[PDB]
Amino acid sequence: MAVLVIKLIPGLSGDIFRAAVELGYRGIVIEGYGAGGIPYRGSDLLQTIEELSKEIPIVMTTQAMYDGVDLTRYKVGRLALRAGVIPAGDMTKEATVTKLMWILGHTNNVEEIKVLMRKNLVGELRD
């Protein structure tokens, strides 16, 4: 049920993500800068997410209002995908979070949540 949405800012550590998981959060949304990607330069964030994305779904949206994410566009983005991050494609922020919450009401299988999040259920997503 419980989702946590965190905005990516320069210097953000993985420590709050680990605290979230320990608290029993069942999903995390990370609102990134643009097309997507997780910092690894002088940051333990990518390493942390790579570790946690096997345990719970970690979804990436963007702070920008329009055009959505594409983790294939840039190198940092591709790294996030390899780390196990679930892109939100062109979904609104509200649809992304409510969709995740809805899915979490049905399953806890990360790979299953992953395929659901990438599937256009009701018109929220271009898949």
Binding site: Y40, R41, G42, Q47
Partner: peptide
Amino acid sequence: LVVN
């Protein structure tokens, strides 16, 4: 910088 540093990357690991």
